[PDB]
């Protein structure tokens, strides 16, 4: 089923090969004879010996033949002897395969083979990974599907199969397996107690199963498993009895905390008595399980509010920030279940604390002072512009801060509302002229550094950084131009525009040279009166 084009392609393929077709051979090799009906080939090498090989392609072809012809055991044996992946038997046709489980089992009919088949299940499909065609739910699903019918036909002499099948589930359900072992031990053809015991001991590496038995909340199971644990009964037996005597729910909490299952420990101890609740807190404050306990307790509980504030405080060490103080003013998921605590007051939690459950009004103007100082130090300068409106008439200081932050029209609003006209030109006019001058200084520095580093690069990265630094000031310059123009500084602003335009053209023309961000062409920084 090939053609001249197909054959020539498979031959050359630009001397690129992949998959089952090719097969590495040795130096000086030759060809002696192919062996059909047995999928072999024999060849001679120069030193004077023979060699017999099984090439993949023939084997896989015959395997597909057999799978279509449904004699499962023949493919099984011919496929295990050659050390080939078993999962392919499912991978070839997962759908139809599942409809013939009992026939497959009758085809195999051997406990060791089924055990070996189980011990190598894997999720991934090698027909898409390892054996390309030349043309979670699955494992548990098939395991239970076959286990049901195989138990139905015989549980007695296939008990170990059931054991392995339940063991090799996605999650280890060791508890039910231990239950089956114990019930067989109680009971007197079928598999015996020590038989399955050894059949699982190597399989489980007992000590973990001993711990699991402790988790299973039954002493008798722990007894049998610990029989083989080699530990001194003088050690654990008094401890085990001590654990047995003490309280049921407290037993649960103590076993979970001994098994690190802190979620179950807290769940048990919550109902084990409110008196132990603070101690629980310590654990969920030591193990940071605040969020978990949030579900255990309910609103309108003092425990609930205490654990909420514990969550917001203890875990937020070095993080007395928006979440901490936020949910403090919230006391958890509740909107406003607490007040009278603010960490830094980032203009929101501060006023939320102050206004909600009003403690001190802005008559106690210390809040305004703190907010102004903090956020102005944070390069905001609008904090004061808002809070001082509620505070004393220090508007002039607000005007000063706006000028420092280049907020011109707000200073104009303050001067024309408070009638502070004397300061209309005393400071702002020279300040903005100096702003234009330092704009020139910075622009010249940018131009010089850009040219220097561009030439240094051209001798044989960071240029784009300076480039992006230059495009940020477009509308800043734009509005500063008109601000100056009210005082009729059109010449200085014209100088500003000319310098900005020259630098813009410099980087614009250098951009194709370098090549890499793209700037925006819809930034307005020019005025007709300026022009």
């Amino acid at each position: 089923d090939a053609s001249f084009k197909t054959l020539q392609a498979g031959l050359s393929s630009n001397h690129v090969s992949h998959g089952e077709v090719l097969r590495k051979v040795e130096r000086g090799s030759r060809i002696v004879t192919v062996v059909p009906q047995d999928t072999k080939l024999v060849l001679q090498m120069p030193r004077g010996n023979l060699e017999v090989v099984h090439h993949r392609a023939l084997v896989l072809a015959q395997i597909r033949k057999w799978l279509d012809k449904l004699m499962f055991k023949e493919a099984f044996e011919c496929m295990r002897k050659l050390r080939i992946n078993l999962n392919l038997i499912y991978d070839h046709n997962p759908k139809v395969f599942l409809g013939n489980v009992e026939t497959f089992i009758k085809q195999i009919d051997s406990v060791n083979h089924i055990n070996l088949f189980f011990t190598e299940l894997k999720e991934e499909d090698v027909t898409k990974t390892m054996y390309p065609a030349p043309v979670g739910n699955k494992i548990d699903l098939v395991c239970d599907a076959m286990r049901a019918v195989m138990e139905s036909i015989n549980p007695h002499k296939y008990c170990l199969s059931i054991l392995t099948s339940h063991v090799k589930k996605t999650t280890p359900e060791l508890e039910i397996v231990l239950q089956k072992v114990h019930e067989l031990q109680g009971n007197a053809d079928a598999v015996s107690a020590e038989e399955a015991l050894k059949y699982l001991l190597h399989l489980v590496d007992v000590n973990e199963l001993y711990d699991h038995s402790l988790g299973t909340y039954d002493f008798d199971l722990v007894l049998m498993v610990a029989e083989k644990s080699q530990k001194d009964p003088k050690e654990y037996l008094p401890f085990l009895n001590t654990l047995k005597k003490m309280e049921t729910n407290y037993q649960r909490f103590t076993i979970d905390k001994y098994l690190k299952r802190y979620e179950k420990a807290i769940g048990h101890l919550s109902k084990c008595g409110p008196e132990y609740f603070p101690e629980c807190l310590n654990l969920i404050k030591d193990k940071n399980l605040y969020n978990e306990a949030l579900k255990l307790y309910s609103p309108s509980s003092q425990q609930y509010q205490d654990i909420s504030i514990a969550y917001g405080e203890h875990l937020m060490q070095e993080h007395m920030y928006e979440p901490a103080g936020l949910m403090f003013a919230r006391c958890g998921a509740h909107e406003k279940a607490l007040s009278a605590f603010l960490t830094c007051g980032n203009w929101k939690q501060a006023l939320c604390v102050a206004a909600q459950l009003n403690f001190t009004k802005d008559q106690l103007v210390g809040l305004g002072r703190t907010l102004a100082g903090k956020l102005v130090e944070q390069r905001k300068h609008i904090d004061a512009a808002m809070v001082l409106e509620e505070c004393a008439q220090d508007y002039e200081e607000a005007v000063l801060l706006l000028l420092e932050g280049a907020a011109w029209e707000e200073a104009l609003r303050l001067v024309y509302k408070y009638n502070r006209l004397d300061i209309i030109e005393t400071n702002v006019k020279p300040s903005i002229l100096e702003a234009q001058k330092n704009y020139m200084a910075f622009l010249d520095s940018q131009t010089a550094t850009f040219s220097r580093h561009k030439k240094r690069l051209l001798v044989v990265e960071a240029l784009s950084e300076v480039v992006q630094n230059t495009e940020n000031l477009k509308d800043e310059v734009y509005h500063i131009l008109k601000v100056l123009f009210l005082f009729e500084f059109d010449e200085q602003g014209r100088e500003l525009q000319k310098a900005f335009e020259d630098t813009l053209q410099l980087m614009e023309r250098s951009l194709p040279e370098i090549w890499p961000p793209k700037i925006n062409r819809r930034t307005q920084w020019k005025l007709s009166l300026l022009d």
Binding site: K24, G48, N49, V52, V53, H54, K81, R83, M130
Partner: protein, 538 residues
Amino acid sequence: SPAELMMLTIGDVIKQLIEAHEQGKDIDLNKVKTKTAAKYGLSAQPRLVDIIAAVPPQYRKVLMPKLKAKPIRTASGIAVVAVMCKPHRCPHISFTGNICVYCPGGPDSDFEYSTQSYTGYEPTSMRAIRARYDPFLQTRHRIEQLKQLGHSVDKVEFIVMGGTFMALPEEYRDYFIRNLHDALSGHTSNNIYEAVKYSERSLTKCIGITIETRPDYCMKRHLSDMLTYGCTRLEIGVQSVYEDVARDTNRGHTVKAVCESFHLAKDSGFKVVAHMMPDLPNVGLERDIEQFTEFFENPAFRPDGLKLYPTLVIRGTGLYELWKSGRYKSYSPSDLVELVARILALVPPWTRVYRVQRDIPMPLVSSGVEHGNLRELALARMKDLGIQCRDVRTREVGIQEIHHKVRPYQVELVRRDYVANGGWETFLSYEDPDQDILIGLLRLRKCSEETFRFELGGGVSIVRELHVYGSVVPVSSRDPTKFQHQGFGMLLMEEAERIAREEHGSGKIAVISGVGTRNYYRKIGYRLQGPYMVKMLK
């Protein structure tokens, strides 16, 4: 005292690492070593030996995976123990005062304590000297020292040093062998047979012994004698492929006798390792190349084990004066490198190289090469020439992983066969071809028409040896990942049996085995007969 200070650092490291283990935290040993050394004012790093020397057992159970030293000592798959015999005389000297023209100091050659072909400065030599050549003392000391490095001793094997062993009084060798077996059994005995029966049920699980010899002591009597000891492989010493050289070297025998010794031993079922001796007097370089090629081209020899030892002129021998007279000249080191590189390109795949170069101390040889390492130089040269070798030791999983860190991905079977000493040999293996990495092997043949053991008369095919490489896995342990208990051997046994039943057309399968290993075959329904495990084929 600084010593207690390093002890405190050791304890600190111990508590840190056990704490990391409890929560399953992973930590670099060297990092904590450096930090602890600095914080305690140490001028030098701590030795790893002392680090292992203080772990408590309830932690040594699981800390060894991160603590073993020099893993290559088990990178093959089987532990190795070497023992030393008492110094004596070689037999040939019965004619004249000639041991061998190139042999080093013997019993009376200007050495206080020494042995034939041994200066006396090998670590094994000092161990024997302290032990006064006592078997039991030295073997206990050596196994204890090996276990100090946290290495499992589940499976062990013995190699015997010494000049000649077959040529010793019988009672002495019986005493020696029973002492060896009692060393592992721990049971005092009275004869060989009692020790054998007791070591059968021991737990050390000894798997065999190998001895050196020479073709003079190769008649079927000595082979039957060795059958009583469980020996598996043998050493001969070939030194050439040209008869004239033997009398030139005053060897005192014929290459023919070597050939019939090979044939007879292979018929019996032992393994054999040869010794090759490049750069000999009256031998050109082309002579060496031709003879080495012959060594595999001829169906006469086709041996199994190979060992090589370049010529080394040493004071005391006649060759010392011959070179001293300026009449025996060696090669330049480059010549030796090229010779070795060419040789390695010729080894058949089944043959396994065991060692290269001697271990003689440097300041004694009048022509000793500077390099204590030669295999590496040959590897560099064969990279330069872009031609690869196919030795077994260089394609097993252990060495390949430890030197290149390559994981097998697709392992399959491979079958080959040839002719040697009239035998129809056959070689089986599992290996991954794409990386040319090998995991398991088997050597099986048809017995010759002429035989010495009547138990093999008619319908009998002998399986000389079987082995899977890797590292030691305790017989109770099942899967530390790795590849030593996945049932691989079972497939090889059943397939070899099927081949012998059909292709060989035999009627009964026999096999040699180590004393403990017999129990293994009991699991397959094999029963004992004489010193041979056997199964009926019908």
